[PDB]
Structure formats: structure tokens, C-alpha cells
Predict the structure of Major capsid protein.
Amino acid sequence: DGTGISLHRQLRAIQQLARNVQAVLGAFERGTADQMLHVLLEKAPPLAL
Amino acid sequence: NRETLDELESAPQTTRVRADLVAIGDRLVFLEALERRIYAATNVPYP
């Protein structure tokens, strides 16, 4: 709109997007630790057996 | 973004005070029984 509102809402949009990208690029660090428990339960016989 | 913009204080006055320290596991907690200190003759019940 040619005002500072148009600038500041753009800076609000970039700061919204900076949260999500660092979230999901951090998610595969945790999704690895998710899956390794799901593969260490796939080959898991109980100690009682 | 990355904000982290919470400001710090000015390192205030650090006095020595007879309080009561114990440690419970990893954490280190006061003990306080506030009867003879703040509620002795005040005639208001302890909460």
C-alpha cells in the first residue's frame, strides 16, 4: 500500500516462515530418533522369552 | 525470525541473609516455616 504497514506485515510474514522452516528441518532430526525406536521394536523379542 | 531480545538487568545488590537451604536430588530448595517470623503475634491464621 506504500505505507509502513505494508513493510511491517511483510516482516511479520517472513518471521512466520522462519519459524516453520527451522521447525521441519529440525523435525527430521527427531524423526530419525522416532524411527530408530520403531526399528528397535521391530526386532525386539521380550526378555521373558 | 530469531528474536531472543529479552533484556538483562543491572546485577543488583547481593546481600547475605540467614535463610534455610536444603537440596532435594538435583534441585535446591528453601525451607520456610513462617510462624515465628511473620505471623507470631499478628492474630491472623496461617494459610
